[PDB]
Each structure stands twice: as C-alpha cells, then as structure tokens.
Structure 1
Amino acid sequence: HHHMRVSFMVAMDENRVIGKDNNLPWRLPSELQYVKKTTMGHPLIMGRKNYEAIGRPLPGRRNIIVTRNEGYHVEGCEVAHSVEEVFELCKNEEEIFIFGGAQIYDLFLPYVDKLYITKIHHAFEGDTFFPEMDMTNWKEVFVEKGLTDEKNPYTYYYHVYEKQQ
C-alpha cells in the first residue's frame, strides 16, 4: 500500500550488537561520514530512545520520532505514533531511512526493501541487538571495506542488500 522505498540504516558487530547503555559501543567517525552522505536529503525515522540519545534534530533532513506518547513534542522534528502514521507522513517521499534503534527496526521489519548495513568485525559488550533477518530473495548490491586508521580503530565493511521480491 505504501509507495516509498523503506531502507534500513544500521551498524552492528559480529553478534548483531548495536547499542550499550543507551549509546553506541564504538566510535567510528568515518562510518558516521558514510551515514551522513548516504542519508542526507532523506527522512530519518528514529525510535524515541535513539532520538534522545542523538539529542538534536539532524540538519537537512526530515526528523521523524516514533513514540507511543501522544503528548510528545520536539521543535524541528515530526512525531509519529505508529508505522501507518509514518507512512502517511512519508507518502510522497522517494526513500526513507529507518535509523533505529532495535524496537523501531523490529517495527518496520515487515516493510524493509533495502538494507544499508555496516558490519564491524569485533565482538562488543552490548544490550541492544539488530533483529535476525531471513535474506532469502535479497541480493548484495554493494560492498566496500571501511577506513581503518588511528581515528577508526576497528575493521568494518559497508554492505547494501536489495530485496528482489
């Protein structure tokens, strides 16, 4: 029924860890630059917890916060309370990025068409996980090694998968 491309944007470790203590377990400035480049000019759909950890509206993008709180407001941001409300807000958009965290990934999992996933080759301590995904009828359309240096101290790869069905 929806017309926009539903893309996931996520970075996870070897065990699907995405978060620890309501924050990111790693610091990879180069990976963040890839995120900014890939998502700029497109709506970011964020779970309420993710948004508050980010702490500010991200410029040059529609920021959409997902919450059950019908009295929730943030200046410079739009608020949605369900998948269907997000779809109404984004009905004329070309592509939207589901930006996390885990609850919001779970929520939009039945609808994802495209996966931008950074895989970090390290096993972090964590408490929040990217959901398991059946990749049947998906194909990898892009893969590239991320920049590892003194500022980016882990080995990681950018992957993009597209759903065929």
Structure 2
Amino acid sequence: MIVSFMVAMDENRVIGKDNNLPWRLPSELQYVKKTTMGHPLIMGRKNYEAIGRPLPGRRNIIVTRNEGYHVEGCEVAHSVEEVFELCKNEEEIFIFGGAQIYDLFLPYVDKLYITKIHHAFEGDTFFPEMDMTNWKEVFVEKGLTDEKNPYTYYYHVYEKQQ
C-alpha cells in the first residue's frame, strides 16, 4: 500500500551525528506518536541499541539477523525479506532502518522524508549531498529555532514513482 520512511540529514554528517541522530520539536514527536500510536516502526538494532528508546508508538520493531536471539523491550524482525511482505500486512507502515538499510529500502519505499539540520560534529555516519537525483521532491517546509532546539532545520518531502 503506502510505505513511509523517515530519515534525517546532518550538515556535517548524514544521520549518525554522535552514536545517534538529532531531534527536533520534542512536542510534535508526542502528538504524532499519540495519534499514530499503534503503527509499525522498523529500526536498525545498531541505532536502537545506542539510543535504546522505551516503546515509542507502542510498536518498536528492530531488524536483526540472528536466529535464537531476542531483544526484550522490542520486537525482532528479519532482513528486508521479511519486512518486504510485512509491508502488505499494514496499509501505512513507517520505516527507519538506517543508512545502509534506507539504501536497500529505496525500491521498497513509496514516500520518503528528509530533514536537513544545520548542526553536526563528529558522528558515526557521514554522507553529504552527493547524489539525490534518484528522488523527486514535491514539497518543502522550514522549521525554527527554540529553547529545547537552539538549532535551525528544514523539512523536505521526498517522493518516488514505484
């Protein structure tokens, strides 16, 4: 049906600014999570491991390959092979995976979002604007600084054909 993917974009990195990804409008995260609470969320064990997170969306699913392994506090998922079909399991599904994951999830994603932040230093995953022609933007929204977020950022809407 509809596959949504959420990914950030560090001005000096790409996603891993410092073992984890930045954050903005901590309030919006609650409103959306409360209204979406129940939607499937796919994330990488590496990112979920460093960050941890309790149970945002009451459906935190981490993709990891290791038979006989189980992570308490989160659901275990298989490679994109499983997620591929799991998609048809729910109308609108959210995917996060990570850097490498997003790459292979390119043909599996229908609509993607990118958030460019003007703040990043020494991280784990760096990848500046090298090639994004594969995608086609349709809308772009700007953000604004704040007390909890003294950093300026911008929201972008990426859409695919398939």
Tell me whether the two structures share a fold, i.e. TM-score over 0.5.
yes
> How far does residue 156 in structure 1 lie from its aligned partner after superposition?
0.4
Give 1:108's match in structure 2, choosing from 102, 105, 108: 105
Aligned length: 162
C-alpha deviation, 1:25, in angstroms:
5.3
Partners of 2:156 and 2:13 in 1: CA distance: 14
- 1:63 and 1:109, CA in 2 relative to 1: closer, same or farther beyond 3 A? same
Instruction: Tell me the CA shift for residue 29 of structure 1.
Output: 3.0
The alpha-carbon deviation at position 152 of structure 1 amounts to 0.9
Task: Provide the C-alpha distance between the structure 1 equivalents of 2:121 and 2:41, rounded to a whole number of angstroms.
Answer: 26
**Cα distance in 2 for residues equivalent to 1:83 and 1:41:** 21
Work out whether residues 42 and 94 of structure 2, in 8 Å CA contact, stay in contact via their aligned partners in 1.
Answer: yes
Q: Do the aligned residues in 2 keep the contact of 1:137 with 1:164 (CA within 8 Å)? A: no
Q: What is the root-mean-square deviation in Å for CA atoms of aligned residues?
A: 3.1
1:103 CA drift (Å)? 3.0
Tell me how far 1:85 sits from its aligned partner.
Answer: 0.9
CA positional deviation for 1:48: 0.8
Tell me how far 1:128 sits from its aligned partner. 1.0
Cα displacement (A) at 1:153? 1.0
Q: Deviations over 1:60-101 (max 9, x none)?
A: 443221111112213453312211111233322112222132
User: Mind listing any 5+ residue stretches in structure 1 that lack a counterpart?
Assistant: none
Question: Which stretch has the larger CA shift, 68-77 or 33-42?
Answer: 33-42
Percent identical: 99
Deviates most, 112-121 or 101-110: 101-110
Asked if 1:135 is matched to 2:156, the reply is: no
Of 138-147 and 126-135, more deviation after overlay is shown by 126-135
The residue matched to 1:91 in structure 2 has which SS? helix
Question: For residues 14 and 91 of structure 2, what CA distance do their matches in structure 1 show?
Answer: 29
> Structure 1: how far apart are the matches of 2:110 and 2:141?
20
User: So what's the TM-score if we normalise by structure 1?
Assistant: 0.76
Match of 2:34 among 34, 37, 40: 37
Q: Does residue 1:20 correspond to 2:17, yes or no?
A: yes
